Design a protein around this ligand. Sequence first.
Ligand SMILES: CC(C)[C@H](N)C(=O)O
Ligand SMILES: CC(C)[C@H](N)C(=O)O
Ligand SMILES: CC(C)[C@H](N)C(=O)O
Ligand SMILES: [Mn+2]
Ligand SMILES: [Mn+2]
Ligand SMILES: [Mn+2]
Ligand SMILES: [Mn+2]
Ligand SMILES: [Mn+2]
Ligand SMILES: [Mn+2]
Lengths: 335, 335, 335
Amino acid sequence: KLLYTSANFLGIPTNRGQPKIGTYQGPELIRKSNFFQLVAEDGIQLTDCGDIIPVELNEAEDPQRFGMKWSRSFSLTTLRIAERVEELMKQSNKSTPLVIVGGDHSMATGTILGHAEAKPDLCVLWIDAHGDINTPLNSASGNMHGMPLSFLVKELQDQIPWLDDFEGIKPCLNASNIAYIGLRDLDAHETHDIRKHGIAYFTMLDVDRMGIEAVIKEALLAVNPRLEKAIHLSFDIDALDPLVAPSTGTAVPGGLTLREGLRICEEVSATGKLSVVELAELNPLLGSQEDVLKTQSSAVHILRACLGHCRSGHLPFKVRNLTDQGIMSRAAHMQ
Amino acid sequence: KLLYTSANFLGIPTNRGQPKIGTYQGPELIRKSNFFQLVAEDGIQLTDCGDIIPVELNEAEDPQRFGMKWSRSFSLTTLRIAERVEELMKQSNKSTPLVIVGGDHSMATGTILGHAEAKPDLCVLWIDAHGDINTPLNSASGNMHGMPLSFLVKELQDQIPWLDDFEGIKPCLNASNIAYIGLRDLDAHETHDIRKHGIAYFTMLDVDRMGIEAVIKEALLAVNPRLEKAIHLSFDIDALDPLVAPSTGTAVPGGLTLREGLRICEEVSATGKLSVVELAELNPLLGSQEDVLKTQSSAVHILRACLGHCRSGHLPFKVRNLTDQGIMSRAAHMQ
Amino acid sequence: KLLYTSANFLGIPTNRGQPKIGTYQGPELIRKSNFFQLVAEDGIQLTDCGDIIPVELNEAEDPQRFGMKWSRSFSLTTLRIAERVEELMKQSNKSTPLVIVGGDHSMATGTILGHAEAKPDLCVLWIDAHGDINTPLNSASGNMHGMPLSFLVKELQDQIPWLDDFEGIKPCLNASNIAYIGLRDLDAHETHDIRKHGIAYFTMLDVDRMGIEAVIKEALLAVNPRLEKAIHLSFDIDALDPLVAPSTGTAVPGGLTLREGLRICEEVSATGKLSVVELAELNPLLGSQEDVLKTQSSAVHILRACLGHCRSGHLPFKVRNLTDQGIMSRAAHMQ
Ligand SMILES: CC(C)[C@H](N)C(=O)O
Ligand SMILES: CC(C)[C@H](N)C(=O)O
Ligand SMILES: CC(C)[C@H](N)C(=O)O
Ligand SMILES: [Mn+2]
Ligand SMILES: [Mn+2]
Ligand SMILES: [Mn+2]
Ligand SMILES: [Mn+2]
Ligand SMILES: [Mn+2]
Ligand SMILES: [Mn+2]
């Protein structure tokens, strides 16, 4: 009665992908929640596999290159992440999903790279207000958390500058393997690339016109039509409306409701093909104490849904009976 | 042009059903609002029938029994509530609905018991994030507000321990007479009992997939197919999302929007069969001053909807005319 | 690839239409936002045409007349607004929309009057929790922001008292030219007049039952069936739920989501017939600092949508290419 009876948990406290200090505290925000207890209460065995230590160079060792900020910290961190994810997913090769808590979204280049090494035919569902697919010369910000997909997409490689230290970051995704849900703040060059290469995408306008149910169905149809592929679910907390996830660095109004976020995760979970879910951009240093609690709570409900938690209830593992205790019931007494 | 031209109002400041002090202030939160004025402005005559005084024993007089906390305060309070509700509903036997403001949800055992004494064929619509149908030996918390339905459901009586002081609490509901809307935090044994006995239930997942309109229709179909039965609407404020009802003791994210809550109440009201509506779990001692105002406001809009308030407008009782005042209009002047 | 390549912007800091000081700061709230920058980034040339100076008489010069508060300030301000709007719209006679930021909603009598002078066959889409169509002797409050449409509707002129200084305020709208979306707090006499004269109206109950998509379609069908008419979009920020627009003087729970507000504006924009959009009732002196930021943000997203901003993305004006810079790509290197 469980699609997944065990799961692994990994923290990746990336913070060199964007300028606001605090994404490094994301994994701890989830560890100090009741997430682990609640997951155990649904009968799932969850193993805490610890944290990846990002590589964080100093400014002298890691100057701007092609406008990118902290690009060598990024390339080194990417390779370290990929090795660890690869090993975890191969020890796993009912499947055992890997739950990853970030950390800013730059971690995804590493997680997908390593995941693809174990499962090369995977698809990616990217849940985000943003495209995170800027190529370096088009990025206004130079922030690596806005570029992680570009390094992975084969079709985009003529717009990525060559760098010796990026050699091991091999493009492992075709444009046809990615689908977005939740977009509402694409940069113009992302829009161009997404349309040019036919990346499936469902923006908040699509959610409004189609409804989340049809959006989920169509996204799964686009990249995983017969549920043959492993799914890498990359969930940026900023996909959710700032009313329910305020503690994040690039909040955009008009986002997914928590319920819409839950539906995406419930449907993905129920495919039986959830292989990795990562949750990016939690920043417990942003907003009020209550803002952080709201954001933490949203994240926990989301990750629980990914692992198969049902809002319609779960049956007990053992049904309790009054008589076994030598207790007299009302029905018994009345007779 | 009014389905209900008069109504009764009753406070029940129960607070021994759960541990957080403050539910006893629920009725006053509504009395100090503009609810009464607004109800009068729609042409309804609302009579304040005062408060029920709960029985609150001391710890020595009311030790834990079968893990239940304050069970004798509960049984005594239940009987006191039922007598008062019964008398009010029989003086009432256009019908006159009774509006009850709590108070924690443990009051429902008493309100339904008394209501059923006046109208034995009634149905119950239970609007709640929670099932409130735990039987005592299955309750992790021992909190009576999580058990009120179990004592009333005939099918569950072999799982209720006999207690002499509970004898007058007679099961007056069949499983087939109850429908839930809004559920998102069932305990495993509740899930078991609800499914085993075929209690109609529409969780937030059902609301997401079906839409509130279909959920309301199907809930009414399940328990009141031809609108032959009186309706007992038991509305836990925690059914609403914490964004609109934060001041309540067991808040769960991902709840009904205020609009969805309004639709449930509007449709129930429009049946002409609303006999009792109770609103449970307001706690003005929880949250900020603004949190309390939001929660108060949500409650007022909800109760107004129950009594027949229309968001699409009400016609004036007397249409005013400019000439009656001896005033010259623009149209008159221009001629 | 742009329906509108230029636009005009006008502030109207009306504050004598209602009692709470602060609506006069509405235009500045938008000017100090990033609205202008974001509009330019989508390729639209936006010209700041400055502010209209409302006429604000003293109490001695402007006593109550027919219960109206500040009615002579209103009539004088109305004529001043209308002259300026008329001149702007005639210099404009791809069309050039006029974006107006208020200011309390009393400004609409002036904006529509002047707009109609340039485009007499226009239709009005009124997005508001309120009807703003009270005739003076029926207004409980005497606040002019609750009456602006009544002076304009030909069918209502036998209920408007004649005043010499209102002579230049000529009724320029038929009941058949107005459609409301968002209503949830009509006064009884407004309900009477709206139904009696067949004004198309879609309240929040209609939005709940029909969905915003059908509501927008039906509103446009009612007043602009073949998109032959110029559209005057009058958007009261209080149409939006107080959760996203708290800083406004008459907030009502259960409003449009930001997304629903965006859909209305996106569809209106896409007709190619958006001629004037005004945004009323911003009050930066109400609520917390965060409340004001939320309200500002909602307003900016709304006005951007009116001017044609697409949540699904915009293409770059020039597509950037790696080689033009003499940079070596990964694809190039690998070959
Ligand atoms: C990621 C987001 C904030 C933006 N597209 C960027 O690249 O910086
Ligand atoms: C009521 C709720 C909080 C829970 N099911 C309980 O029984 O305590
Ligand atoms: C505008 C609103 C607050 C109300 N209908 C009034 O006329 O004052
Ligand atoms: Mn993002
Ligand atoms: Mn992201
Ligand atoms: Mn509850
Ligand atoms: Mn309850
Ligand atoms: Mn309004
Ligand atoms: Mn208005």
